[PDB]
Amino acid sequence: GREEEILERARELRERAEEAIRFLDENADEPWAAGPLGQMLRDIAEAIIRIAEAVELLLEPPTEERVERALELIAEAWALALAAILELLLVKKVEVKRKQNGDDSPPTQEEIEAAREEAEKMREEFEKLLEEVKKEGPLTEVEHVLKLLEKFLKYLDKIIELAEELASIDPDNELAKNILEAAKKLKELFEKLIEELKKSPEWLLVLAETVLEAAETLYDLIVKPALEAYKA
C-alpha cells in the first residue's frame, strides 16, 4: 500500500527527530547545546517533526480544508528548516573566520543576532509569497504549489553557494560538507518534483513522498551526524 507506506515513513521520521530533540535537551547544560549551533539543530529537528505531522494530514480523506492547511504547514515547515540551515552556515562562517584570525572567544551576540535576523528575513519573505499566492487561488492547484517549490529552489541555491564558500574557507569542516551535500540533494529532489507534479494524477502522494525523503536527508546528513559528533 503506497499510502500506508507513506504514513509509516512519516511516523518513523517523526520519532527519529523527537529522539534528536530529547538528546539536545538531556544535554542542555553543555555549552554547545545552549549555543547557536544547538538551537539551529533543534529548529531543523522541529521542522522535520512538523513536516511529518503535515504529511499525515495529506494521507486522510481528501478535502479542500485539510489539504490546503496541510500544504501550508509543509511550506512553512520547510521555510523554517531552510532558514535554520542558513543561520547555521552564517554562524559557522563567523566562527571559522574569527578562530582563523584568532580570538578563540565565541562569536559575539551581535554577530549571532545578525545571522538570526538574516535567516528570519528569508522566513518572512516566504510567508509573504504564500499569502499572495493564496489570494490568487488555493494551494490545491498544482501551479500554485510549483510557485512555492521554485522559491524553495532559490533559497536552496543560496545555501549551496554559501556552503561552498565555508568549504573553501575550512576544507575539512564536516558540518559544511554535510549541509552542502544535503542542499544539493534537496535541490535535485525538488527539481524532479516540479517536473512530476504536472503529469502525476496522485500528486499529493508524490509531494508527500518527496518531502519525507527530503526531511530524511536533513536528518541523516545534517542533524544526526552533528549530534553524534558531540556524543564523541
Numbering used by the authors: 1 to 232
Quote what the paper states about this structure.
Here we use a robust deep learning pipeline to design complex folds and soluble analogues of integral membrane proteins. Unique membrane topologies, such as those from G-protein-coupled receptors, are not found in the soluble proteome, and we demonstrate that their structural features can be recapitulated in solution. The soluble analogues were functionalized with native structural motifs, as a proof of concept for bringing membrane protein functions to the soluble proteome, potentially enabling new approaches in drug discovery.
The core topology of GPCRs comprises seven transmembrane helices that facilitate numerous non-local interactions, enabling them to bind to a variety of ligands, including photoreceptors, odours, pheromones, hormones and neurotransmitters. We tested 56 designs, of which 36 were expressed to be soluble, and we selected the ten most highly expressed designs for further biochemical characterization. Of these ten designs, nine were monodisperse monomers in solution, and all showed the characteristic circular dichroism signature of α-helix-rich proteins. All ten designs also showed high thermal stabilities (Tm > 90 °C). Last, the designed GLFs preserved the canonical seven-helical bundle characteristic of native GPCRs. This accuracy further extended to the side-chain level, for which comparisons of crystal structures versus design models for GLF_18 and GLF_32 showed 1.54 and 1.40 Å r.m.s.d.fa values, respectively.
